[PDB]
Short mmCIF file of C-alpha atoms in Angstrom, two decimals:
data_model
loop_
_atom_site.label_atom_id
_atom_site.label_comp_id
_atom_site.label_asym_id
_atom_site.label_seq_id
_atom_site.Cartn_x
_atom_site.Cartn_y
_atom_site.Cartn_z
CA UNK A 1 8.96 -4.26 -17.88
CA UNK A 2 7.95 -1.49 -15.15
CA UNK A 3 5.49 1.77 -15.05
CA UNK A 4 6.28 4.96 -14.03
CA UNK A 5 4.50 7.71 -11.76
CA UNK A 6 1.34 8.66 -13.73
CA UNK A 7 -1.49 7.43 -10.83
CA UNK A 8 -1.99 4.12 -10.29
CA UNK A 9 -4.17 4.26 -7.56
CA UNK A 10 -5.16 1.32 -5.42
CA UNK A 11 -8.77 0.01 -4.71
CA UNK A 12 -10.09 -0.58 -1.07
CA UNK A 13 -9.18 -4.15 -1.56
CA UNK A 14 -6.24 -3.66 -2.50
CA UNK A 15 -4.88 -1.50 0.49
CA UNK A 16 -6.73 -3.71 2.66
CA UNK A 17 -3.69 -6.06 2.15
CA UNK A 18 -1.37 -3.07 2.81
CA UNK A 19 -3.55 -2.12 6.32
CA UNK A 20 -1.81 -5.04 8.24
CA UNK A 21 1.44 -4.43 6.18
CA UNK A 22 1.62 -0.57 7.17
CA UNK A 23 0.46 -0.81 10.60
CA UNK A 24 3.25 -3.24 11.73
CA UNK A 25 6.02 -1.55 9.89
CA UNK A 26 4.94 1.89 11.41
CA UNK A 27 5.39 0.22 14.82
CA UNK A 28 9.39 -0.94 13.62
CA UNK A 29 9.97 2.61 11.94
CA UNK A 30 9.09 4.43 15.06
CA UNK A 31 9.39 1.52 17.51
CA UNK A 32 5.56 2.56 19.10
CA UNK A 33 3.54 2.68 16.18
CA UNK A 34 1.41 5.69 15.60
CA UNK A 35 -2.42 5.43 14.21
CA UNK A 36 -2.38 9.05 12.38
CA UNK A 37 0.73 7.88 10.49
CA UNK A 38 -0.70 4.45 9.13
CA UNK A 39 -3.83 6.43 7.33
CA UNK A 40 -1.57 9.09 5.90
CA UNK A 41 0.50 6.33 4.37
CA UNK A 42 -2.37 4.25 3.13
CA UNK A 43 -3.67 7.27 1.63
CA UNK A 44 -0.38 8.44 -0.28
CA UNK A 45 0.09 4.99 -1.77
CA UNK A 46 -3.48 4.88 -2.57
CA UNK A 47 -3.57 8.50 -4.51
CA UNK A 48 -0.31 7.46 -6.27
CA UNK A 49 1.27 10.02 -4.63
CA UNK A 50 5.30 10.78 -4.70
CA UNK A 51 7.89 10.47 -2.10
CA UNK A 52 8.21 14.36 -2.65
CA UNK A 53 4.49 14.72 -1.72
CA UNK A 54 3.68 12.02 0.36
CA UNK A 55 6.54 12.95 2.77
CA UNK A 56 5.18 16.05 3.34
CA UNK A 57 1.55 14.45 4.16
CA UNK A 58 3.79 12.19 6.91
CA UNK A 59 5.81 15.06 8.33
CA UNK A 60 3.58 16.47 10.95
CA UNK A 61 2.72 12.33 11.30
CA UNK A 62 6.50 11.29 11.42
CA UNK A 63 8.61 14.50 10.20
CA UNK A 64 12.16 12.80 11.45
CA UNK A 65 10.71 9.31 10.25
CA UNK A 66 9.18 10.27 6.89
CA UNK A 67 11.59 10.10 4.13
CA UNK A 68 12.95 6.97 5.91
CA UNK A 69 9.36 5.71 6.54
CA UNK A 70 7.76 6.75 3.01
CA UNK A 71 10.93 4.79 1.41
CA UNK A 72 9.83 1.34 2.65
CA UNK A 73 6.11 2.13 2.02
CA UNK A 74 6.28 3.31 -1.76
CA UNK A 75 8.48 0.14 -1.87
CA UNK A 76 5.91 -1.92 -0.34
CA UNK A 77 3.62 -1.69 -2.62
CA UNK A 78 5.47 -4.37 -4.83
CA UNK A 79 6.41 -6.18 -1.27
CA UNK A 80 3.03 -6.63 0.66
CA UNK A 81 0.88 -7.19 -2.78
CA UNK A 82 3.96 -8.89 -4.57
CA UNK A 83 2.10 -9.83 -7.42
CA UNK A 84 -1.50 -10.39 -8.98
CA UNK A 85 -2.64 -8.14 -11.72
CA UNK A 86 -0.52 -9.21 -14.84
CA UNK A 87 -2.19 -11.24 -17.12
CA UNK A 88 -4.91 -9.04 -18.57
CA UNK A 89 -3.68 -5.50 -19.64
CA UNK A 90 -6.85 -2.85 -18.65
CA UNK A 91 -5.93 0.42 -17.48
CA UNK A 92 -8.37 2.98 -16.35
#
C-alpha cells in the first residue's frame, strides 16, 4: 500500500530529479518563478516536512501561493519520481 508521514527524506540524487520539476512548477504557480521558493521547497520535501510545517517555510516565499503550491509539491514526489524504490524493502 502506501506510507504515512514519519520522515522518508530524499537523497541528493532523489531531489536532483525534483529540482527541474520544481523550478518549472514554481513558475506556473506564481507565473514568474522564484529562486528562493525553489529551494524552500526542495528542503521541505527533503526534510519529510508536513504541509503544515512546509507551508510556514514557503510563507515568506509564497504566502498567498503557499498552500496552493505546497499542495502540488507534496504530490510531486510521486509525480516527478513516479517509481524506482519498490523491489527491496530497506528503511534506514
